[PDB]
Amino acid sequence: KNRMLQEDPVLFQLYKDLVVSQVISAEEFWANRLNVNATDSSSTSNHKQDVGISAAFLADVRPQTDGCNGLRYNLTSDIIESIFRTYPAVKMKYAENVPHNMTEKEFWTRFFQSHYFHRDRLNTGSKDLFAECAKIDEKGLKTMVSLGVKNPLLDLTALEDKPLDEGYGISSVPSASNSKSIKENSNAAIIKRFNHHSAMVLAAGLRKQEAQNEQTSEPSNMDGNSGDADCFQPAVKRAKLQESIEYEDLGKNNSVKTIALNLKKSDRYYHGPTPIQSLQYATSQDIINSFQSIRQEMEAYTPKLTQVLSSSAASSTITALSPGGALMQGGTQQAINQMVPNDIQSELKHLYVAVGELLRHFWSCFPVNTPFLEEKVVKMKSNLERFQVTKLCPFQEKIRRQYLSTNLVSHIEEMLQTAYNKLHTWQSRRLMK
């Protein structure tokens, strides 16, 4: 927890004033601040080139195993560590020969110089890992027996003991099998070496989450290229049903909002004798009346010359052309009134909002009396005094002046109030013993 508060100076600057202004404790600091990022923020050091490394690094362990005589020790995993992070009994073997090669740097070259080429028989430690890997494949033999399905080692064996043959099918090699004895020895070990590298997945597949079912062949395997399984099945009338009732509710209640309803029906009621149509008669008469009046446009020749109605039209133009007396210089103390609260109190207030949001949260479920924990019902009580006291001296430091203070304190008292709201509302649901 302490490396977290030292490597991050911003959160440390947050963590300072809970000790500096004595807001909360460290016990209270790690009780309601983190609580989620214990999985999220700690997801960096655990993964680190995908831990439980099975099939990510194993592609690149052999090409990046050597740059030079000393091209090693990059960072943490650089080019040596995840080699150790797969072999376990072979890691015990590494530990066995570090004093045999004295210097660990010497070990980095020696233990891996002869094992890389063909074969490593120079030291007990190299021979330990060498012999173990034959036992590993012997150990890996027994596991493949337990699966034993889709494995024609079974199916091949039925045809060779039966005539006592397929020993000649083994012993029928052409192409000068007489006088070399070099790569015959060599390649089968490289066959063995990369099957180790192949079973290095298997040596790390157990690290994944132990990964076992071992295949009792599941005798169905129904070749299903046909059938039309068609996995997803929506459209069993779900938003069809919403549309039938909500537009019905948007029909019977079309916009019952602020201006959206109250001015609406009030002027529809003003239309009055509209089913009586006597207003509609005069309407349709006035539809018939000014029908002809528009088109002549001699009446609509001079529907312009009213400079009587220009002056007033010029007036509220000029009235809105000059608003006056509204404190043109509204700032210019704001720089002093920025740097003093945005030195501590930006972060100080943030100490509350990391907590006070949870203070809204436990009360956001409390009358159900389910999330009622002693960890929480006194966490209601805990930070209550831990915040509403530690703001009072930041409150009392700024009441050094009067109108310099009374403007900003109109906006800080919400913090006092949202505290006391929560506290005030806490007993609106009276809790028993």
Binding site: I245, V256, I259, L263, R268, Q280, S310
Partner: protein, 295 residues
């Protein structure tokens, strides 16, 4: 640069324009549109490139007053660009015969609008919403008319004169949000009542909303304000600054609320007085909707 198109949406409520005559006004519908006509011509007076779009709102329809829909412009379709080889209406022009090229076509078609006083469709009032897109498709084609070194500066005028109608609230809101995609200014002068909804549409645009001071006094603000370019207003320092707009009520009972809550996945935010879903017959999953009723 560019071509500088104008769009004008005029309220023509003959219920209300009949009611405009019921007071025996000193400002009638005849006095209305003629200002709006020359207002449309005023657009044309800045540049030969300027193009106009005029559509009123009849109770049954909204026919394109401008450009036209009859045999005077069904075979004419304007003189500049793709000519009809039409002599008489293709002959006289220059600041005064262009207007009587368009004066005729409005008064003949409002004649076709004001001969249909035969409404029996249960007060089918101001049908702004569907009338809006009638421009928007057409200018999309006009976007596809020429664009080659031709920025289409369209500008939408909305004129309100009466109350809004009972139209579909979604189909109210969406086209503005589609106009929000469309990047075209929309400006609004109202006459009689305020429209909180349509002034929200102005807020979407950042256009301009206007309550008129007086209906016969609608010739100087209409001159100054409802006047184009977004250049004349981003440079002309005179903006109606007011735009007081509180909103956000809910739909089950009636409210004015700061806290909403949805009823189903269907985006139905209702009033708190709501046991069972009136958005559907699908019941609410019983963990959350009584927590609206818990605290």
């Amino acid at each position: 640069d560019e071509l500088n198109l104008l769009v004008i949406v005029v309220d023509a409520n003959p219920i209300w324009w009949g009611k405009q005559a019921l007071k025996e006004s000193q400002f009638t519908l005849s006095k209305c549109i003629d200002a709006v006509m020359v207002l449309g011509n005023s657009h044309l007076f800045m540049n030969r490139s300027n193009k106009l779009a005029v559509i009123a709102s009849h109770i049954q329809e909204s026919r394109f007053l401008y450009p036209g829909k009859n045999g005077r412009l069904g075979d004419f379709f304007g003189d500049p660009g793709n000519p009809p080889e039409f002599n008489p209406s293709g002959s006289k022009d220059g600041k005064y015969e262009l207007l009587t090229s368009a004066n005729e076509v409005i008064v003949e078609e409002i004649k076709d609008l004001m001969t249909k006083s035969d409404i029996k469709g249960q007060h089918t009032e101001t049908l702004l919403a569907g009338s809006l897109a009638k421009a928007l498709c057409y200018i999309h084609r006009m976007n596809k008319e020429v664009k080659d070194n031709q920025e289409m500066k369209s500008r939408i005028l909305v004129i309100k004169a009466a109350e809004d109608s009972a139209l579909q609230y979604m189909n109210f809101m969406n086209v503005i949000f589609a106009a929000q995609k469309q990047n075209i200014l929309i400006d609004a002068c109202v006459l009689d009542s305020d429209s909180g909804l349509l002034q929200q549409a102005c807020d979407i645009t950042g256009g301009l909303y206007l309550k008129v001071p007086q209906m016969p006094s609608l010739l100087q603000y209409l001159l100054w304000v409802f006047l184009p370019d977004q250049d004349q207003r981003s440079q002309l320092i005179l903006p109606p600054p007011v735009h007081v707009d509180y909103r956000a009520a809910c739909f089950c009972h009636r409210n004015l609320i700061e806290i909403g809550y949805v009823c189903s996945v269907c985006l139905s935010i209702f009033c708190n007085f709501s046991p069972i879903c009136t958005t559907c017959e699908t019941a609410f999953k019983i963990s959350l909707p009584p927590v609206l009723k818990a605290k």
